[PDB]
Each structure stands twice: as C-alpha cells, then as structure tokens.
C-alpha cells in the first residue's frame, strides 16, 4: 500500500522497489545527572544594580537554577532573542550561562537595539552575537532585597584629544561585550548631568587626554533593569540545567544494544550504547567525531560506551501486477533480527524475505531480479528461484591427426532489433 501511495496510482508496474523503513521506536531512557549545586544569584538579588557601562557579569558553569523563582521576581517588558528562545532556556541544558545585568530605563530600550548609532552602543554596552543571546528588560520587585540606585546614568562622550595641543578629537568606541575606559571616571554612577572628566593617558596607553561626559536621567518609580543573556553548547563536561523534573538516574546495563533516549550530564539525544574498549581521554566525558557527533561516552559504571545512532531496517517490496502478490525484502539483516525482535521469513543472500516460497527452482529468464543471482518467479505465492547459467556445449579434441569441427546442417534467419537515438 505504501508503494501505491509513493507512485500515487493504483496501477504500478511489476518490479522491485525501495520503500521507506518504518519508524524506529525508543525503548527506554538513559539518564545520568549529578546532584550539582544551586546557581548563586545572590549578587543579583541582594544588592543595588550597577549602571549600563559598569555592568556586572555572572557566569554559571556546573549548577542548577530555579528559573521559575527568577521569572516570578521580575516582570519582563520586552525580550528580543536571536539564536535561541527563552522557553529553550527553560527546558534545556547548556555548558555555560552568561548574564550581564545592569540598571536601565525602559524609555531608552531603543538605544540597545542592534545597529543603533546612539551613545549607549558606542560607550556603554554593545551586545555580542557570537553566541545564542537574548536581551531582556524587566522590572525589579518592589519590596525585596534589590535596592534602587540614585538614578540612571550613561556615558555620553569618551574621546581622545591629540593634535597640535588638543584640537584633534577622536572618539573611543567599545567592542561588543566590553567596558569603556571612561567608566573609571564615575564607576558608581555620575552625580549630575553633564559631568566633565579629564585624565592624562600614559605612554603605554597611547598618550593624549581622555575626556568623558556623563548623562544622568531621573530615577523612576519602580526599578527597571536590563539583562543580556548568552549560552554556550558543547564547551564543557558539565551543564547548567534549570530544575526540570527529568527523573531518576537509570542504568544502561540492562538495555545495551537497544535504541533509547539519553540525557548524559546535559547532553541529550537518542542512540544505541555498546560496551567498548576505552578510547579518548576519560577526563573529557564525551568522544566526538570530526562532524561533531557523539560517538563515545564514559559512565559512572566505569565503562566506555559506543553511542551508535538509532537506525531502522531497510525495506523493499517485490510487486507482480498480473498475479497480484507481493513479498518484503529486509536488506542486509538476518532473519534472527526480524523473527525475534519485531515490534515464514527466509534467509537469502540479499537479506531476510517474507512472502517467497523456497521451491528450489532454477529459471533461465526472470523479470524480478532480487540481486546476487536471486529472483522471484510468480506461481498463489511468489517463489524464490535462482537465475540459471546454461552450461556451454563441450567438444572434446580429436585424438587422431586432424581436428573435429561442427558445421551447420539446418539454419534460420534471426532478426536482431536495435534502436539508436539521434535527437
């Protein structure tokens, strides 16, 4: 029936066709998760947030965190993510999580968009897009431990004065995810608007006069914060996982050789696990190929498991339109796999076949060749027959002086037809 659908017709010519292998099923789970520490957010939750140009950075590596508590405390006004989504952050593991948090008014959120020509991008913060990142603007809890700053301040100018004496001016712009050297003028925030700060740069710093101007905006009724969040994958042996209820750790010992889903220290997927001689460096928990695929694993059991991809048995259908019967060729798989692990069969050189009957026939011409000198001959079941090799006639040499020949006595005219394409 799948052959009819593939050809989209009830009338299909007799032949041997390749159909889709049936869907493979997972047969268990292989979970190995440690009881890792809780990610320390006590700096973000207990303290006064800094300014945009003096942002704090948190990197979490080998810990679990409760994202529900963090999201309950804050009230997100707008988030813009590229490369990843917040739900994916909420339901998956990653090698690292970097959170750059700072105080930021919601009115200026337009000045943090990619491509802005304003002063925030040049002198205060520029988001890096080398990793899957999201930018989040929210509101802090009203009466919790987060204390509002005096005001919101940002750097409006950061230039270098190097000319005949000072006339030539050159602005100093920050690379993505980096601080401005004008931050050290007022590292705890600018006191008033238009504060003018001047420092003499040393020779090792290039020389000149560094000029910085700060801009201050009044504090709002509720504290408004901005977060720049980035994650990494495949760069660590341990993962940062939100406290999702994955379940208890399981042992692959009882399910070796079957295809199961796995969650191994934050790395997820499906595949087959086989006992293997230890290769690679044990300290690095995973062994990869050139194409960045997981091919080996080291377990708490102490063994090294080869992670073969989850596969399915190839299928082929033999169809004979006139007799209206079919057989199934399971290629390259012995009948023991089909007979005992299916979720009568006959073993042939092309695989295991259900439908044919071994009558031990030999046929000179058969139009359904299975391969390896095997073909199906219709009979009401198709029968497995072998293509015949007609033995050449043998003419023994003559023992006398001369030689023996076979000359024709009767003949016919045989018309051989040939077609040559020309256009």
């Amino acid at each position: 029936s799948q052959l009819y659908c593939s050809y989209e017709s009830f009338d299909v010519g007799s032949g041997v066709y390749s159909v889709s292998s049936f869907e493979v099923h997972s047969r268990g789970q292989f979970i190995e998760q440690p009881n890792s520490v809780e990610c320390d957010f006590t700096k973000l939750l207990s303290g006064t947030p800094p300014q945009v140009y003096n942002f704090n950075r948190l990197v979490f590596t080998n810990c679990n965190y409760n994202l529900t508590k963090l999201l309950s405390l804050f009230m997100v006004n707008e988030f813009s993510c590229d490369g990843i989504s917040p739900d994916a952050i909420a339901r998956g593991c990653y090698s690292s999580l970097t959170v750059d948090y700072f105080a930021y008014p919601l009115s200026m959120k337009s000045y943090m968009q990619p491509g802005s020509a304003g002063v925030i991008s040049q002198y205060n913060y520029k988001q890096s897009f080398a990793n899957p990142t999201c930018r989040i603007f929210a509101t802090a809890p009203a009466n919790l431990t987060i204390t509002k700053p005096s005001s919101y301040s940002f750097i409006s100018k950061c230039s270098r004065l190097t000319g005949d004496n000072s006339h030539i001016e050159t602005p100093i712009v920050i690379n993505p995810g980096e601080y401005s050297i004008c931050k050290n003028f007022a590292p705890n925030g600018f006191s008033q608007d238009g504060d003018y700060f001047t420092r003499q740069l040393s020779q090792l710093e290039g020389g000149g006069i560094l000029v910085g101007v700060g801009s201050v905006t009044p504090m709002t009724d509720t504290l408004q914060m901005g977060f720049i969040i980035s994650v990494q994958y495949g760069t660590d042996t341990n993962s940062v996982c939100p406290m999702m209820d994955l379940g208890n750790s399981t042992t692959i010992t009882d399910k070796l050789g079957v295809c199961v889903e796995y969650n191994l220290y934050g790395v997820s997927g499906r595949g087959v696990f086989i006992n293997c001689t230890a290769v690679g460096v044990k300290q690095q928990r995973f062994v990869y190929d050139g194409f960045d695929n997981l091919i080996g694993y080291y377990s708490d059991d102490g063994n090294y498991y080869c992670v073969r991809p989850c596969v399915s048995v190839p299928l082929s259908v033999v169809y004979d339109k006139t007799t209206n019967s079919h057989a199934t060729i399971f290629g390259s798989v012995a009948c023991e796999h089909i007979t005992t692990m299916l979720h009568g069969p006959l073993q042939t050189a092309v695989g295991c076949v259900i439908g044919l009957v071994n009558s031990s026939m030999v046929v000179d011409n058969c139009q359904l060749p299975l391969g390896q000198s095997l073909c199906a001959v219709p009979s009401s079941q198709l029968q497995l027959a072998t293509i015949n090799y007609t033995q050449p006639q043998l003419l023994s040499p003559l023992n006398s002086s001369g030689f023996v020949v076979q000359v024709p006595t009767n003949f016919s005219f045989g018309i051989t037809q040939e077609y040559i394409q020309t256009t």
Partner: protein, 272 residues
C-alpha cells in the same frame, strides 16, 4: 532518406570501394552475401526457394516483436519517457514553494504587503533560476549524448545497411547478412538479419593436405574445411556439403607437420 536505403547500390561486393555502382537485383545480392559467409553456390542453387521461405518467416516475425519484453523496443519508450520527463520537471518546479508561504505569486501578493512580499517573491525567483540552471545543464548533456549517438547511427548504416560487416556482435548477433533500418521516434530502428545455425554435424577435418614429393606441395582450404564423408572433400564453413577439392577452394600453403600426407586418391591440385 531512410526508404531510399533499401534500393541503394554500392558495388559488386567483391569490389573494394564506393566508386562503382552495380545494379545487381536484391535477390542476387543476398546469395552473394550468403556465399561470403561460407556457403557454396551448390547449396544456394539447390536450396534457392528454401532460403526465401526462411527469410520471409523472419520478416513476418518482427511484426510481433514490438513488445515491452524486447530490449530494443523498450529503449524506444525510454527515449519518449526521457522527453516527457523533461517537460514534467519544468511543470513540477512551479509547484515548488522554496520556503515561501506559497508557490503562487498571486497568493503572495494577496497574502502579504511590502517589504515582506518582495522577500517571498525573491525566494521563488532564486529557486526557479536555480532550477532552470539545472534544467539547462541536463539538456546539454542529453544533446551531446544524442549527438554522439547520431554518429554511431551513421556508422551503423554505412557498415550494416550499405554493406555486410565481418565484425561479430556489431550489426547484430550471428553472422550478418543484411540490415534494414526504418525511422523511429527520436532515432532509427534497425533489423539485423543474421545466419543462425540450428542443427550441427560433427565431422573430422584436416588442417591441410600434402603429397609425398620433393618438395612436398601442400594446400589449405580457402574459406571452408577439408572434410571426410578415404577421400577428402571441401565443405562450406556455414553449411555442410562435401565437394571436390579444386583451385576454387584450395589455396597453396607452405609445408607443415600437422597436414595429412596423402598417397592415394589425391586431389587434382596435388597431382602431377
């Protein structure tokens, strides 16, 4: 062009070029062709009507050979299907969305407004331009294949239709006698008529005959076999008919140790 190849005249057969033109009737050309494959004129003169009856049976049989089981007739359909599949690919690629919201430009204009509709239209443009480039590359390869197959078509007509090839396998199996070509869809259709032996007789042969004289004069057959039927006889390669050894079928050769030393009932070439 093709129907004129049937009555064409190119030479006497034993001639060695295309310069001459001999108006030998079609009947007498076949018998000379059959005499070139190893049948003596005595068999032809005796089985004159037998050959024609066999030939007419072969010509009537090719009427029923136009079936999918035949290899040559299948190649005709494969060429028509190759042409048809070329047009099918062009039609199918306009049902391709290439990732757009639709495969129809009308749907994109109906469903979307600029600047988003330009991006969706440009998605179809790049896909269809890429599809045509793949179509052009395939057509060029097919055109060269047909061009080089047309060269073989000119080769086949010159060697099989306008002459009698001595090459085994080429111009059909068996032994080539005459080939007829007719117009076919997107090419030509040939009919390689061959001499197919049906029954055999095992007969003792001799590599050659020599006489016990000084120096020993020895002969070898021209295009047949020395054959026993104590006397030796000449037979054709393609048909059995013992005939006397004479200058018409005996060719002088140098002395060899594998030839028969004859002392009685010598052939006329070895006499005197």
């Amino acid at each position: 062009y093709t129907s004129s190849l049937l009555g064409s005249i190119a030479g006497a057969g034993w001639t060695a070029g295309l310069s001459s033109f001999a108006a030998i009737p079609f009947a007498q050309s076949i018998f000379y062709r059959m005499n070139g494959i190893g049948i003596t004129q005595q068999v032809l003169s005796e089985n004159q009507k037998l050959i024609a009856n066999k030939f007419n049976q072969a010509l009537g049989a090719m009427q029923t050979g136009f079936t999918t089981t035949n290899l040559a007739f299948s190649k005709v359909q494969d060429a028509v299907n190759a042409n048809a599949q070329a047009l099918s690919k062009l039609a199918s690629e306009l049902s391709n969305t290439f990732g757009a919201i639709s495969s129809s430009i009308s749907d994109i204009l109906k469903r979307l407004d600029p600047p988003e509709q330009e991006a969706q239209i440009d998605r179809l443009i790049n896909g269809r331009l890429t599809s045509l480039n793949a179509f052009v590359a395939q057509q060029l390869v097919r055109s060269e294949t047909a061009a080089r197959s047309a060269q073989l078509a000119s080769d086949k007509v010159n060697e099989c239709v306008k002459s009698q090839s001595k090459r085994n396998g080429f111009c059909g199996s068996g032994t080539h006698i005459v080939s007829f070509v007719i117009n076919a869809p997107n090419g030509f259709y040939f009919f390689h008529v061959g001499y197919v032996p049906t029954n055999h007789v095992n007969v003792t042969a001799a590599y050659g005959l020599c006489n016990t004289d000084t120096p020993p004069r020895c002969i070898a057959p021209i295009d047949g076999y020395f054959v026993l039927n104590d006397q030796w006889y000449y037979t054709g390669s393609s048909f059995f008919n013992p005939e006397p050894i004479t200058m018409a079928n005996a060719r002088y050769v140098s002395q060899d140790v594998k030839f028969e030393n004859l002392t009685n009932q010598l052939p006329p070439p070895l006499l005197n």
